[PDB]
């Protein structure tokens, strides 16, 4: 039966079950799994000779000795190794097996990591954090994240209007083959401004525009009805025909295929001398570089004619003002390249060079005539160092950034980051704005501020970037479901029938597209032939059914509403409550045809509801043909904006500011920080989970690695030291552990013997023997030249005693003063087998007059002054505030969410609960919070008679005080005075 008022808990069982299965870096991991399981193989098997199959081991390390031993990701982090698995191939000439060709970096916690199924116990026996999401590469010790680069969708015709130039309208189509053997090759089809407006086709590998009818005759459609039958599907449209009349004249001279092929080849990159050679050049340029996604063959010419006629027809529809010009910012028109596509593109080039060099080597030996010996002909470092370099460096620039490990939310928000490019496509669109189509799929709040505002984006929480598929099952089903090909039809039937595209390529026509869409949906809602991430749009007015199985279509799950009732019945919720010891997960809910994945251009044919409880209830009818439903409307927010409580009460500049400052709050950033020698870790002593918390924080693990402390905050003008954004801190609270922090820094040095002489060596320099430019102080070193853990190091004090031999000294000192304590001194050997040392020093950081603190409602302030407990304004119970903030900060920022967080936090601390600040609740007012605050004996609006701590006298106006979650921003002041 239906769920009528149990909805808000049904809503969140369905979301818990989503995040139990997927997680939050599922797009990274699914993309790398696809790469390493499908794309490496179909890359070697698309190499022209030969290499047979591909094996990939688990990440292994060989020492200077030589022995395959597994490397765990922590031993890779510490010793500065690359966490990479060897790639073996089978080559045939005899035949060889498992010929090692390179080493491929392994994304952590993906199917080929050694930490893939390990339980949380055996993740801790390897010193790995069970909450670490994985989804990054360990390359030379560094943890690298492949930012997901967004780009324009290929294979689709986009008709834009060239502002000026010489073209009134231009319809482009970036085409790329199935397995992207050769890069995309854009073709344009423009209509000149202003006989009449002639149409020209800007082909690849051709320097001049070509009349469109020339390109239709070069394909072998000599006549003139046999060129308009491909362009104008209804000849009784006299308005569209007179637009092609001016162009059937520019190509009046040329009436045969070969003179047209000559006309084209005369414009090529290499204008040959022979008419036959120019004809053959133009023949292969139209046969391989014009619309390759339609086909590359000797008979893909009546399909390229149909597709080029489609591009021309769609340019005419735009010029006639019969179809809207295409939006360059719409996200149906974009695709996100994740670690799978990026690395497969990076691996095509390196396998190409491996082939090139095995040929260049074996040729020498066998034209000499002795023998080739393939297995030393293989330079494995091609693949190895190519992948490793392009990941370690980021130059593919701005892909492959170092993973941000300041907070857990900073990390999770780095592994779900997009990147709108500001290249030529950023020059033509408005890429910095929030488009309507980002709804549910990119976070509207989370963006950087300054020079990259709106260019770097973040996924919403339930947004999933599709990983890719194969259209062959769909193509066979379509043929079997009475779809006529583009060869067995007469262009007289193509008129009132429905085009059927599959991945851009026009595949057929169908005469009943309603029944076909019903069938295809019913199949995708069972995962029979169509996987769940396959998009199926129907343009009813345009008469097309577009079907996408691409990789990079961002999508999101939505409840299905048949007629006007959810299909999510009460039994699905009852079975998901028992999600353990039942094996009923998210996938048993997808596969039950009750939840769908809708992508950004399938999302324009749907009629969403926000809530079942309101939207599909009979009333004065707005819409009564709803087809989907939001699970929860707060799943439109990203990871760092799911921390903000009551974000529907702040102004969006404040949600954006906080999204940016939730990535700077200290906290505990990962559980095994005790073994991680990062440079610069910040760890709060006593983090606290928020007392007013979003329901979307149960899945961000913010109760387990929280970043901040619940302060008691008074909004009051106390002594003027909270002037604009400054705050007044309790000095006694700060003495009792409030917002104290630890700051770790690691220093590495290696004992490299690079040249013959001039060897660097670890040794206590001071006044030993053969001294050079010994500086201040060298007495805390032990005799191996390394300081020992537990000694107190001050400013300009020596850490590692290295001498580069008559010996110069190249000792390591602390980074210009901090007076920490040496925490851990690990000694090992790098890849080269040289001695290697990482030394971590620890510095406690007590909040000070300069340190910056910020609320979850987006404004940050230094600490103006710190008064002890007896100087603070107290209550008639002795509750002195922890933070006093200025009143004149609140109004100007629209953060009523800050005052509602204090009010709800007071009720939660008194009631013994933890309050719900989920955005779109409607079961949480301010009146309902006030009527509960007035039950614990407080003023219903949170005011409280405070007394003056200096003179003891009441303060004439009652001060607004209550517990608010405060964050200690990573900035502070110890980092500037040293």
């Amino acid at each position: 039966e239906i769920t009528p008022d149990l909805w808000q808990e049904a809503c969140w069982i369905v979301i818990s079950s989503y995040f139990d299965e997927k997680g939050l870096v599922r797009q990274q991991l699914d993309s790398f799994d696809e790469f390493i399981q499908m794309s490496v193989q179909r890359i070697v098997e698309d190499a022209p000779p030969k290499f047979e199959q591909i094996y990939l081991s688990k990440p292994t390390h060989w020492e200077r000795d030589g022995a395959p031993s597994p490397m765990m990701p922590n031993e890779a982090r510490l010793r500065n190794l690359t966490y990479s698995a060897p790639l073996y191939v089978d080559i045939t000439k005899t035949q060889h097996q498992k010929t090692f060709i390179g080493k491929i970096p392994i994304m952590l916690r993906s199917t080929y990591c050694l930490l893939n199924g390990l339980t949380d116990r055996d993740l801790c026996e390897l010193n790995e954090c069970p909450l670490d999401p994985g989804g990054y590469f360990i390359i030379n010790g560094s943890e690298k994240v492949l930012i997901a680069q967004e780009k324009m969708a290929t294979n689709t015709v986009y008709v834009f209007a060239k502002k000026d130039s010489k073209y009134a309208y231009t319809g482009e189509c970036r085409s790329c083959l199935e397995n992207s053997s050769r890069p995309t090759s854009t073709i344009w089809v423009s209509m000149l401004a202003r006989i009449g407006q002639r149409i020209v086709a800007t082909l690849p590998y051709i320097k001049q525009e070509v009349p469109i009818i020339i390109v239709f005759r070069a394909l072998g459609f000599v006549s003139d009805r046999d060129i308009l039958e491909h362009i104008i599907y209804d000849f009784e449209d006299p308005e569209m025909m007179e637009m092609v009349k001016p162009s059937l004249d520019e190509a009046f001279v040329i009436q045969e295929q070969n003179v047209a092929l000559n006309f084209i080849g005369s414009r090529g990159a290499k204008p040959g001398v022979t008419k036959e050679k120019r004809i053959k050049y133009a023949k292969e340029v139209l046969q391989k570089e014009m619309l390759p996604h339609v086909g590359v063959s000797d008979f893909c010419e009546t399909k390229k004619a149909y597709f080029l006629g489609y591009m021309v027809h769609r340019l005419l529809l735009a010029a006639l003002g019969r179809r809207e010009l295409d939006d360059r910012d719409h996200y149906g028109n974009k695709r996100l390249d994740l670690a799978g596509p990026l690395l497969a593109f990076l691996f095509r080039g390196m396998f190409k060079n491996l082939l090139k060099e095995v040929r260049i080597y074996a040729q020498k030996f066998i034209d000499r005539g002795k023998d080739f010996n393939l297995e030393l002909a293989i330079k494995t470092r091609i693949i190895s160092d190519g992948l490793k370099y392009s990941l370690a460096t980021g130059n593919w620039a701005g892909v492959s950034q170092v993973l941000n490990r300041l907070t857990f939310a900073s990390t999770l928000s780095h592994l779900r980051r997009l990147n709108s490019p500001i290249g030529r496509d950023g020059k033509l669109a408005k890429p910095r704005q929030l488009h309507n189509t980002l709804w549910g799929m990119v976070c509207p709040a989370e963006t950087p501020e300054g020079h990259a505002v709106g260019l770097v984006k973040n996924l919403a929480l339930m947004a999933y970037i599709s990983v890719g598929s194969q259209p062959s099952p769909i193509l066979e089903f379509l043929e079997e479901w009475s779809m006529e090909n583009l060869e067995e039809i007469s262009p007289a039937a193509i008129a009132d029938a429905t085009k059927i595209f599959v991945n851009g390529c026009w595949v057929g026509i169908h005469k009943d597209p309603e029944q076909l869409m019903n069938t295809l949906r019913k199949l995708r809602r069972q995962m029979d032939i169509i996987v769940s991430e396959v998009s199926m749009i129907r343009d009813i007015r345009e008469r097309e059914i577009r079907i996408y199985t691409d990789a990079g279509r961002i999508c999101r799950p939505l409840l299905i509403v048949e007629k006007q009732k959810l299909l999510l019945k009460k039994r699905h919720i009852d079975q998901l409550k028992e999600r353990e010891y039942n094996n009923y997960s998210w996938q048993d809910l997808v596969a039950s045809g009750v939840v769908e994945y809708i992508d950004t251009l399938e999302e324009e044919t749907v009629m969403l509801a926000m809530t079942p409880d309101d939207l599909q209830e009979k009333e004065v009818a707005y819409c009564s043909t709803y087809t989907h439903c939001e699970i929860h409307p707060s799943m439109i927010l990203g990871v760092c904006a799911s921390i903000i409580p009551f974000p529907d009460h702040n102004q969006s500049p404040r949600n954006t500011y906080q999204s940016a400052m939730g990535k700077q709050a200290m906290g505990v950033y990962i559980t095994n920080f005790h073994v991680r020698m990062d440079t610069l870790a910040h760890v709060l002593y006593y983090p606290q989970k928020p007392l007013v918390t979003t329901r979307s924080m149960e899945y961000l693990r913010f109760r387990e690695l929280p970043a901040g402390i619940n302060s008691i905050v008074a909004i009051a003008s106390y002594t003027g030291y909270n002037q604009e954004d400054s705050v007044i801190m309790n000095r006694s609270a700060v003495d009792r552990g409030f917002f104290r922090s630890v700051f770790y820094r690691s220093y590495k040095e290696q004992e490299s013997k690079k040249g013959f002489d001039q060897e660097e060596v670890f040794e206590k320099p001071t006044r030993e023997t053969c001294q050079g430019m010994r500086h201040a102080i060298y007495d805390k070193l032990d005799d191996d030249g390394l300081i020992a853990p537990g000694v107190r190091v001050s400013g300009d004090d020596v850490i590692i005693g290295k001498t580069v031999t008559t010996k110069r000294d190249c000792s390591t000192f602390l980074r210009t003063s901090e007076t920490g304590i040496v925490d851990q001194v690990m000694v090992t050997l790098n890849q080269e087998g040289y001695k290697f040392c990482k030394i971590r020093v620890r510095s406690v950081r007590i909040p000070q007059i300069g340190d910056k603190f910020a609320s979850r409602h987006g404004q940050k302030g230094t600490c103006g002054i710190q008064y002890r407990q007896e100087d603070m304004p107290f209550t008639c119970e002795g509750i002195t505030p922890d933070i006093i903030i200025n009143p004149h900060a609140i109004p100007s920022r629209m953060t009523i969410g800050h005052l509602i967080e204090c009010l709800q936090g007071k009720v939660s601390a008194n009631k013994g609960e933890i309050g719900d600040a989920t955005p779109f609740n409607d079961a949480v007012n301010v009146q309902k919070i006030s009527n509960l605050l007035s039950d614990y004996g407080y003023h219903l609006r949170g005011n409280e008679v405070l007394y003056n701590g200096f003179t003891g006298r009441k303060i004439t106006s009652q001060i607004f005080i209550g517990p608010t979650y405060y964050q200690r921003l990573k900035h502070m002041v110890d980092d500037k005075i040293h």
Partner: protein, 114 residues
């Protein structure tokens, strides 16, 4: 206004003049095919271009979930109570905000503006 196509090579027939009788011919430029026209018009430019949009809208749009339905506008053809209104949204007639209705009963699809 329309295109005439030859009957031998199927290329386009261009207009020419018949002197000896002074009558408008349409003649192909790849053959000696000729055809005494019936139009006596060569070219028509409609600048104001009052267009019927009741002819561009296909009845299949009555299968759109995202389109607003109605009850106080019964189809005149079949008397079906429901309809599906929408606007033009076409660069030429985007100025006005006139509503078109498409009867929503199956097999009717009768369009009408009011």
């Amino acid at each position: 206004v329309g295109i005439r196509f030859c009957q031998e090579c199927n290329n386009m027939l261009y207009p020419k003049e018949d002197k000896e009788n002074r009558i408008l011919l349409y003649a192909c430029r790849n053959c000696d095919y000729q055809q005494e026209a019936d139009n006596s018009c060569i070219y028509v430019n409609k600048i104001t271009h009052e267009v019927d949009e009741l002819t561009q809208i296909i009845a299949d749009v009555s299968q759109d979930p995202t389109l607003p339905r109605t009850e106080d506008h019964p189809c005149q053809k079949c008397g079906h109570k429901e309809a599906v209104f929408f606007q033009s949204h076409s660069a030429r007639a985007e100025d006005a905000m006139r509503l078109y209705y498409v009867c929503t009963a199956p097999h009717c699809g009768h369009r009408w503006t009011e």
